[PDB]
Amino acid sequence: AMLSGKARAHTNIALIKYWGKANEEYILPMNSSLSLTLDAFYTETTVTFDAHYSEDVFILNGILQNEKQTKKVKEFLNLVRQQADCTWFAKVESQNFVPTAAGLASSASGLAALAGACNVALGLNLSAKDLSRLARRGSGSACRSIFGGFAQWNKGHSDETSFAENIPANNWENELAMLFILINDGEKDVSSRDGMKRTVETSSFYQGWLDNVEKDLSQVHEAIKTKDFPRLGEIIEANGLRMHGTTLGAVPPFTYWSPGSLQAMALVRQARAKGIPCYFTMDAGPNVKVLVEKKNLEALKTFLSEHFSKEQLVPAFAGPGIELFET
Amino acid sequence: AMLSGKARAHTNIALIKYWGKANEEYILPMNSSLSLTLDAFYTETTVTFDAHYSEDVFILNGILQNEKQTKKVKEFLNLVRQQADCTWFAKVESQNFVPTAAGLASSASGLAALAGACNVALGLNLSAKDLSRLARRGSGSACRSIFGGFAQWNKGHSDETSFAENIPANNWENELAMLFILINDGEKDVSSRDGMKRTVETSSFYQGWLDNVEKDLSQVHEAIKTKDFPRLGEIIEANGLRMHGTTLGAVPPFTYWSPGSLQAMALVRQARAKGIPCYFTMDAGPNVKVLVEKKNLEALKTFLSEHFSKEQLVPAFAGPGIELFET
Ligand SMILES: Nc1ncnc2c1ncn2[C@@H]1O[C@H](COP(=O)(O)OP(=O)(O)O)[C@@H](O)[C@H]1O
Ligand SMILES: Nc1ncnc2c1ncn2[C@@H]1O[C@H](COP(=O)(O)OP(=O)(O)O)[C@@H](O)[C@H]1O
Ligand SMILES: C[C@@](O)(CCOP(=O)(O)OP(=O)(O)O)CC(=O)O
Ligand SMILES: C[C@@](O)(CCOP(=O)(O)OP(=O)(O)O)CC(=O)O
Ligand SMILES: [Co+2]
Ligand SMILES: [Co+2]
């Protein structure tokens, strides 16, 4: 009386940010978002549901996770057990090939992989659309890691209509790269979930964010259709700066940036000034991601090595959607 | 046929920021502001109007200023010459005891001192209120350096009704201190005037700024009446963060912060956590000012010496209003 399943999902980095939930229970977002799934960082997860288990167990990077660290996995397991009428405790064994809780989207790859493993184990036979909807319930960004390359999370207006899909770009995504500047791989002070809730509920800047996100998304789409790299980069750099601006208007205000974040951002502007087209974005933490055409990646890593070590510059290319495995 | 005059004015640091002009020609602000005039940084300026001069001359720190560097002094001289019907060129000799164009309010002390020197030389016999109105025409923050201690610039609605005045605080200002952390005394990339104009005209966050400034000012006034230091510090720290947030929503966005700015801000929060009540604010540049009660100033300088040199921690106390000199 045992059901098991496995999946691999890659991280994604948001080009147009998701920031703030319209519905906290179902993770319905205030705005639509768009990301690039990457090849460098991924999560591998197996789940086992077994009548003989006596409690839910979460093992991450070979390390048993404590009650606080398991609370959310347990929330996702409860949700999927209701969606199957399954009453069995589960064992979740996951390995993050990506720093955890550091602004490098380990919740995207991690909850996507768990959703996929659960889909397999409980024989749910979900379409990609419906697997995206389930992953959304664990972490918003995870619903986009179901797909490769460019993916859009349509905010919709209900559990049924909020989900992601691939954005065809006539192969453009394979002509691009993202260079991670690792300022700090440690666990971050304010979680993505808590930070965006504080922003929604208290930031005087949040309406400004909302009033600009759809225009940014439209221009990202026009840029894709024309493979206009400077236009893409200007939109996404400003979109990320606008998102981080919102936390300075929260009550109390806060920032995800660290000193090295600003150093890296300024350096990206120097690189542009000195003839390397590239644009930075930051998800919810201090690390800096630099969008750059593949042909300029080595140029950029060398430029940036003047201030960061080899261990701090990690390149990445477009990556695949989720991979399921019956075991 | 020569008229001469001299004045000394001290810098001020805004606790509630002025950010954005409702009228660029007359420097009427979008919101009222409140500052503390300080004893550590000041400007000394002499002006001479003489029928024999052949052009306006501006000498700053013993160095002749070029055309670009004199444009604004020339605008202030033209204005004051119209207000006297004087047709004579002038020589302005000024010494800044304060880094220039670095976010340490050298335009406040400098244009205040020039306004005072011109008042003297042309025998204008201005009340403090009217001298504040004239200094306002050279630099907004300068209209507050006419007064000592706490001073408020009332935005008014016309050249006649926009001016500053002292805020009585039952001696509280003499129980306080401000510690400057000098991250970079160099000349800054984006001027205060250009930065705030870009913000007014393009920032999606500017309305949020406007919608909160009057509430901040009110609470600063209640805190003064009760000498409530924690309440003052929380208001002013959030007000400064909100002001800097507005530039991340500008088009194109920008920041005045440098890496050391964030380091210093984080350290101030550590100091609070480890039992030293103190609060940071930043004017338009990378340097960080820390409001602190006098009794905790040495504690704080020692705490901060773990990461900054002696040459980077400059203390300051409340300072006087403008001093005029007939020569
Ligand atoms: N492999 C995983 N399986 C389950 N939950 C995970 C996994 N990796 C990360 N998480 C969850 O994601 C949280 C971090 O979420 P978030 O604050 O969005 O950070 P990040 O920048 O890593 O995406 C972790 O503390 C944990 O709750
Ligand atoms: N002593 C002075 N006399 C005249 N103008 C001055 C003086 N000191 C500074 N200024 C003007 O102020 C400008 C800096 O203004 P601002 O951008 O507000 O910088 P700050 O942070 O120093 O106040 C200088 O470039 C110059 O135009
Ligand atoms: C700024 C972002 O990186 C925030 C991602 O937040 P999460 O997707 O981690 O949050 P939850 O829905 O609470 O799990 C932008 C993005 O990934 O779209
Ligand atoms: C953020 C501030 O430091 C900006 C001061 O700007 P200025 O008074 O230098 O600007 P102008 O009116 O253009 O001369 C806040 C303040 O001093 O009130
Ligand atoms: Co996340
Ligand atoms: Co993200």
Ligand SMILES: [Co+2]
């Ligand atoms: Co100034």
Ligand SMILES: [Co+2]
């Ligand atoms: Co100022």
